[PDB]
Amino acid sequence: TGDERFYAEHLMPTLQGLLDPESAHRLAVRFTSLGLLPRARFQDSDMLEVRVLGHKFRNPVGIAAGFDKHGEAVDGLYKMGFGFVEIGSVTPKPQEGNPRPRVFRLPEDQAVINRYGFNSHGLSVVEHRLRARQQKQAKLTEDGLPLGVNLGKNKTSVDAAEDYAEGVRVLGPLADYLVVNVSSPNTAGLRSLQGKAELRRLLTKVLQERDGLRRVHRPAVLVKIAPDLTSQDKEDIASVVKELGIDGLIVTNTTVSRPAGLQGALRSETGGLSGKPLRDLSTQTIREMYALTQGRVPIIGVGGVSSGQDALEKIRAGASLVQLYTALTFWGPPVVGKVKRELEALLKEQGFGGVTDAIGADHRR
Numbered sequence: 001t002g003d004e005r006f007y008a009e010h011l012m013p014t015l016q017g018l019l020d021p022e023s024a025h026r027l028a029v030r031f032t033s034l035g036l037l038p039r040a041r042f043q044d045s046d047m048l049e050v051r052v053l054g055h056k057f058r059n060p061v062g063i064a065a066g067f068d069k070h071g072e073a074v075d076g077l078y079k080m081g082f083g084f085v086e087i088g089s090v091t092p093k094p095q096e097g098n099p100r101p102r103v104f105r106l107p108e109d110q111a112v113i114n115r116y117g118f119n120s121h122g123l124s125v126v127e128h129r130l131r132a133r134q135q136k137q138a139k140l141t142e143d144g145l146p147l148g149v150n151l152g153k154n155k156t157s158v159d160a161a162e163d164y165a166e167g168v169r170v171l172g173p174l175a176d177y178l179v180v181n182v183s184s185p186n187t188a189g190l191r192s193l194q195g196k197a198e199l200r201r202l203l204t205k206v207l208q209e210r211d212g213l214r215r216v217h218r219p220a221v222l223v224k225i226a227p228d229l230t231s232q233d234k235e236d237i238a239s240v241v242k243e244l245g246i247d248g249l250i251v252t253n254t255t256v257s258r259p260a261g262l263q264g265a266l267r268s269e270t271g272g273l274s275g276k277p278l279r280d281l282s283t284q285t286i287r288e289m290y291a292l293t294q295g296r297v298p299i300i301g302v303g304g305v306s307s308g309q310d311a312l313e314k315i316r317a318g319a320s321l322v323q324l325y326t327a328l329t330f331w332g333p334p335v336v337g338k339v340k341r342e343l344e345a346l347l348k349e350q351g352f353g354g355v356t357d358a359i360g361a362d363h364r365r
Ligand SMILES: Cc1cc2nc3c(=O)[nH]c(=O)nc-3n(C[C@H](O)[C@H](O)[C@H](O)COP(=O)(O)O)c2cc1C
Pocket: 064, 065, 066, 067, 069, 088, 089, 103, 112, 114, 116, 118, 150, 181, 224, 252, 253, 254, 274, 275, 276, 278, 302, 303, 304, 305, 323, 324, 325, 326, 327
């Protein structure tokens, strides 16, 4: 489309020329919340519908955690054409996150590095924000547009599992699915929660708390994992997810690695790397986790999706749904419809009747 080119060649590089990335993101959140967005001409076809996690999803393309950290732009994001929205990470208490600058663009790599450190309005603020549109969300959910809430831990917390449990109690009842984010690279010690013994203790507490919620307010619980795990760590996570009946996995968070070949001047900034250089590392992690869980555990695939091909590769590797963030940063809102249009085209070319038929297809080759 004309919009796709104008955004990608004029609008977004102009905004990028004028504003540091944190400013630009704040402005984007504001515009989205106000619905100041291009017409999302693409109409979701039936071949894009997916049923998973106890819900219908109109299309399989979601906004990944971190874009709407505090639940300010949910309805704007649906307007953009996302099949599902994930907010967060939310921490129990408000906290500022790290000092600025803390986000960096690598335009020559189609990548970003961030070290926000869980800047969060906190659970209470977010709770009230979601409660203000709770029945609007219930109607959206019923219409195939579910809401996920991603939970974090405060920096100075003395009991990580208690932070997650507090999140489950507070925001669980307002979410279709919850995400235990134990893979930020920007909170000290957090990724050690992916270890077998820590994860089993943590997840048992999280699941107990979730199962204590009233039926109609009981969300699915997913775990979001890093792209930098060892084979032992992957194995362990798969074992615990089966042992406990975790509902799904989000694969992956940003990478602490710096793949050879990065060109951006800012490549050696501390933080998590997202975008194109993370793409195949995340696809491979999806593939491994789908096989370790025997294809029985839904996966939301994320990292470096910017086209229909990128989405289909993750679907074929084992994702039931995909998310993106960094593509939006570079191409703007039209990227969403682009991905969907291209995905539908490729599904037809590859002889799939819909998305559902393509889930895990590479493992049946
Ligand atoms: C600026 C920024 C903030 C993010 N914040 C969060 C967060 O709060 N919680 C989380 O689980 N993931 C967060 N992520 C990771 C994304 O959700 C996603 O997993 C990652 O960016 C890979 O997707 P992408 O390559 O499409 O951006 C963040 C990523 C970026 C770039």
